[PDB]
Amino acid sequence: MNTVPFTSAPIEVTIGIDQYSFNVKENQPFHGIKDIPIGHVHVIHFQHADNSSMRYGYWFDCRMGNFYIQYDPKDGLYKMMEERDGAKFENIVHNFKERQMMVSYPKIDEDDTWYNLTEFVQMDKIRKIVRKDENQFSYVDSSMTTVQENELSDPAHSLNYTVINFKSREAIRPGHEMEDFLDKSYYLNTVMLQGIFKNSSNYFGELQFAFLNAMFFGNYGSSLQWHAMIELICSSATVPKHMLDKLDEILYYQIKTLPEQYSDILLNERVWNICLYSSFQKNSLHNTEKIMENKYPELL
Amino acid sequence: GAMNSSNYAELFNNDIKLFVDDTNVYRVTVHKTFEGNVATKAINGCIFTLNPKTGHLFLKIIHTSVWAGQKRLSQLAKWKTAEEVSALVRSLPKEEQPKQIIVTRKAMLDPLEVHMLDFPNIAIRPTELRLPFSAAMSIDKLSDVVMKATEPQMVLFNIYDDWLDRISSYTAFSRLTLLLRALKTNEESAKMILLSDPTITIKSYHLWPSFTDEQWITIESQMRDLILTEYGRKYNV
Ligand SMILES: COc1ccc(C#N)c([N+](=O)[O-])c1
């Protein structure tokens, strides 16, 4: 179990760690988060009390280094940093653990939610979507735009998700216009899976990461990406059986975790109604269709 | 974006554009079977592709053989239309290719956009106008060439005959749409008006009768009377 210590909490802030969150008061003696489960990526995220504008945060994996959070009064945010001196960190952390100045990552033993939300998410792929190669962790916030959004303006600060566009030469073979537009299997299976992602695990990983950025930061381009990746599978007549079964599980846990009050903005009516009721895969997502109908019957 | 009453003169500027109407592409007669069920029998159709500035009509005849062994024909008809329009554009010299294509039905937008991906600079636009191009098969010479076709065929016409020698393209289009609206609302009465006089003749190379300017005023008046009436006969007013 690993630890992300904090030098201090000089400004009042709601701190999230994965799907958990807690309020820290201005200059409260808070010095970090302990008992973080090893083996998963994690996200530690922030919303200031004074400016609910800009949720922001950091994706990280404690196996890749020792990370600590420090408030920067110039840039006005909590920054993740890496401590190379493994003894400065062991001692700095032990001091804070002995003084009980840390919150415990509050996982219930039965609870597989975080695993189920991040099953295919890997730090190395996060770091290719979020390009900042001098750091081992990745900053995301509510305002960052996606590469595809930029095409339709700072490239250093973009989300480089895989561009998916159903009315594009990449998606449509000359001579198969109608066939490929109405059945996207060649785009899914040959262009994206075999060609770009290489396997379905990497596809699902980007889909899951896009959802998490939409949920935790209200990042609109990430929501667009999540829905596009769902719609590309549902609009394919030919999808490997294992992928459909895994997609059903993935979406179930995303829909289960979504705040009930954010459904209006984070869920695209057209995509979900098409995927669950019109598409080729309308009968392949039993778990997802059941939770959607019992939790958000209005949207449908 | 969409074409409506407010940007109407754009049709007669010097940017090449085509209207595409797909109404008459997939045409059927519905009939009873010996077992008393219902079946359709397709008949030849056409794509109506029209330059509104010049009158040039590219009439792609759709022979019933194109539907043999195909499913969901009303959906296929939209993609067949887009394939043929795309093939037409590719066949034209660059300087004759349209800068915009206006579809009369919004369901043609995605089929045509996908077929024209090679032409990112050609704008595909819907319209808010209720244009009467479906009545094109009420023009006897167009109907004749569609029904006689035994294979796919493109036939080129000028739907304005020689009118542009005497009137503007705005006025020619207004006359065309008036004639077609009449033919659509009451084909028999409209046709009586036009060619009920046997001493008035259509030229071999023309589609409509050779009216003098004064006879066109009378004719156009008789069509507007027909349309208003039917609009009464229809709503009782
Ligand atoms: C200036 O270096 C450091 C400052 C604060 C902390 C903390 N918390 C760490 N650490 O290793 O966790 C390093």
Between the alpha carbon of residue A61 and those of residues A2, A33, A38, A137, the distances in Å are: 10, 14, 8, 7
**Cα–Cα distance between B83 and B69 in angstroms, integer?**
18
Ligand 1 in contact with A7 (CB < 6 A)?
A: yes
In the structure encoding, which two tokens stand for residue A105, read together?
């990552």
**Cα–Cα distance between B146 and B55 in angstroms, integer?**
19
Q: Do B83 and A177 touch (CB under 8 A)?
A: yes
Q: Do B83 and A167 touch (CB under 8 A)?
A: no
Pair (B114, B195) in one structural domain: no
The C-alpha angle A217, A218, A224, rounded to 5 degrees, equals: 120
Which residues have CB under 8 Å from A17's CB, separation 6+?
A33, A36, A42, A43, A44, A45, A105
**Cα–Cα distance between B99 and B119 in angstroms, integer?**
10
Query: In angstroms, what is the resolution?
Result: 1.5
In the structure encoding, which two tokens stand for residue A271, read together?
């995509």
Q: Does B104 fall in a domain?
A: yes
In the structure encoding, which two tokens stand for residue A172, read together?
């449509």
**What single letter denotes the amino acid at residue A171?**
A
**Cα–Cα distance between B88 and B83 in angstroms, integer?**
9
End-to-end CA distance of chain A: 42
Residues A171, A184: contact at Cβ < 8 Å? yes
Residues A230, A275: contact at Cβ < 8 Å? yes
Identify any residues that bridge with A16 across adjacent strands, giving them in sequence order.
A21, A45
Domain limit, last residue, from B111, B130, B163: B163
**Cα–Cα distance between B36 and B55 in angstroms, integer?**
46
User: Which residue does chain A place closest to B81, by CA atoms?
Assistant: A178
**Cα–Cα distance between B189 and B196 in angstroms, integer?**
10
Three-class secondary structure of residue A182 per DSSP: helix
Q: Do A177 and B110 touch (CB under 8 A)?
A: no
The shortest C-alpha distance from A177 to chain B (Å) reads: 6
Encode B146-179: b = buried (16+ Cβ within 10 Å), e = exposed: beebeeebeeebbbbbebeeeeebeebbebbbbb
CATH of the domain at B177: 1.20.80.40
Closest CA to B145 of B57, B77, B223, B21: B57
Residues in chain A: 300
Between the alpha carbon of residue A120 and those of residues A124, A202, A207, B16, the distances in Å are: 11, 7, 9, 52
Ligand 1 in contact with A272 (CB < 6 A)?
A: no
Task: Count CB-CB contacts under 10 A for residue A84.
Answer: 8
Q: Do B117 and A181 touch (CB under 8 A)?
A: no
In the structure encoding, which two tokens stand for residue A242, read together?
């294992």
DSSP string of A93-142, one letter each residue: HHHHHHTT-SEEP---TT--HHHHHHTT--HHHHHHHS--TT-SSEEEET
DSSP string of A234-298, one letter each residue: HT-S---HHHHHHHHHHHHHHHHHS-GGGHHHHS-HHHHHIIIIISTTTTS-HHHHHHHHHH-TT
The shortest C-alpha distance from A263 to chain B (Å) reads: 29
Bridge-based pairing of strands A20-24 and A13-17 is: antiparallel
Q: Do A169 and B83 touch (CB under 8 A)?
A: no
Between the alpha carbon of residue A172 and those of residues A129, A168, B153, the distances in Å are: 25, 6, 27
Chain B CB contacts of A183 below 8 Å: none
Chain A CB contacts of B118 below 8 Å: 169
**Cα–Cα distance between A152 and A149 in angstroms, integer?**
5
Best residue in B70, B78, B79, B114 to probe A by mutation, most A CBs within 10 Å?
B114
Pair (B109, B135) in one structural domain: yes
Which residues have CB under 8 Å from A51's CB, separation 6+?
none
The architecture (CATH level 2) of A116-299 comes to Alpha Horseshoe (1.25)
Domain limit, last residue, from B163, B185, B211: B163
Pair (B136, B22) in one structural domain: yes
Task: Count CB-CB contacts under 10 A for residue A39.
Answer: 9
Pair (B42, B127) in one structural domain: yes
DSSP state of A169: T
Pair (B111, B193) in one structural domain: no
Domain count, chain B: 2
Residues B117, B83: contact at Cβ < 8 Å? no
Chain B CB contacts of A178 below 8 Å: 76, 79, 111, 114
Residues in chain B: 237
Pair (B55, B146) in one structural domain: yes
Residues A131, A160: contact at Cβ < 8 Å? yes
Helix (H) or strand (E) holding B39: strand B38-43
Closest CA to B205 of B146, B168, B157, B147: B157
Q: Does B116 fall in a domain?
A: yes
Q: Do B114 and A169 touch (CB under 8 A)?
A: no
Domain carrying residue B173: 164-237
Is A242 buried (19+), middle (13-18) or exposed (0-12) by CB count in 10 A? exposed
Ligand 1 in contact with A88 (CB < 6 A)?
A: yes
* Alpha carbon B202 to its chain's center: 20
Nearest-atom number in ligand 1 for the CA of A67 is: 12
Span from the CA of A194 to the centroid of ligand 1 (angstroms)? 44
Pair (B52, B146) in one structural domain: yes
**Cα–Cα distance between A23 and A30 in angstroms, integer?**
10
Residue with tokens 């009216």: B211
Residues A229, A210: contact at Cβ < 8 Å? yes
Span from the CA of A40 to the centroid of ligand 1 (angstroms)? 23
The strand ranges marked E within B44-158 are 45-50, 56-62, 100-103, 123-125, 153-158
Measured in degrees and rounded to the nearest 5, phi and psi for residue B18 equal -125, 140
Closest CA to A186 of A264, A230, A239, A226: A239
Span from the CA of A86 to the centroid of ligand 1 (angstroms)? 10
Ligand 1 in contact with A82 (CB < 6 A)?
A: no
**Cα–Cα distance between B118 and B97 in angstroms, integer?**
13
Measured in degrees and rounded to the nearest 5, phi and psi for residue B29 equal -100, 135
Chain A CB contacts of B79 below 8 Å: 177-178
Largest CA distance in chain A: 70
Nearest-atom number in ligand 1 for the CA of A68 is: 12
Helix (H) or strand (E) holding B36: none
Q: Does B149 fall in a domain?
A: yes
Closest CA to B117 of A202, A14, A128, A175: A175
Which residues have CB under 8 Å from A92's CB, separation 6+?
A5, A68, A83
**Cα–Cα distance between A204 and A243 in angstroms, integer?**
9
**Cα–Cα distance between B165 and B175 in angstroms, integer?**
14
Sign of CA dihedral B117, B122, B127, B133: negative
Residue with tokens 């959070």: A69
Nearest-atom number in ligand 1 for the CA of A93 is: 12
Span from the CA of A96 to the centroid of ligand 1 (angstroms)? 11
Residue nearest (by alpha carbon) to ligand 1 atom 3 = A83
Q: What is the CA radius of gyration of chain B?
A: 19
Between the alpha carbon of residue A266 and those of residues A83, A222, A260, A263, the distances in Å are: 36, 10, 10, 5
**Cα–Cα distance between A199 and A258 in angstroms, integer?**
27
The shortest C-alpha distance from B91 to chain A (Å) reads: 16
Pair (B44, B70) in one structural domain: yes
Between the alpha carbon of residue A114 and those of residues A37, A38, A60, A254, B203, the distances in Å are: 10, 12, 14, 10, 80
Domain limit, last residue, from B163, B196, B225: B163
Q: Do B79 and A177 touch (CB under 8 A)?
A: yes
Best residue in B117, B118, B124 to probe A by mutation, most A CBs within 10 Å?
B117
Half-sphere exposure of B61 (CA within 13 A, CB side): 22
Encode B31-65: b = buried (16+ Cβ within 10 Å), e = exposed: eeeeeeeeeeebebbbbbbbbbbebbbbbbbbbbe
Q: Does B1 fall in a domain?
A: no
Instruction: Indicate the residue of B79, B82, B117 with minimum beta-carbon distance to A169.
Output: B117
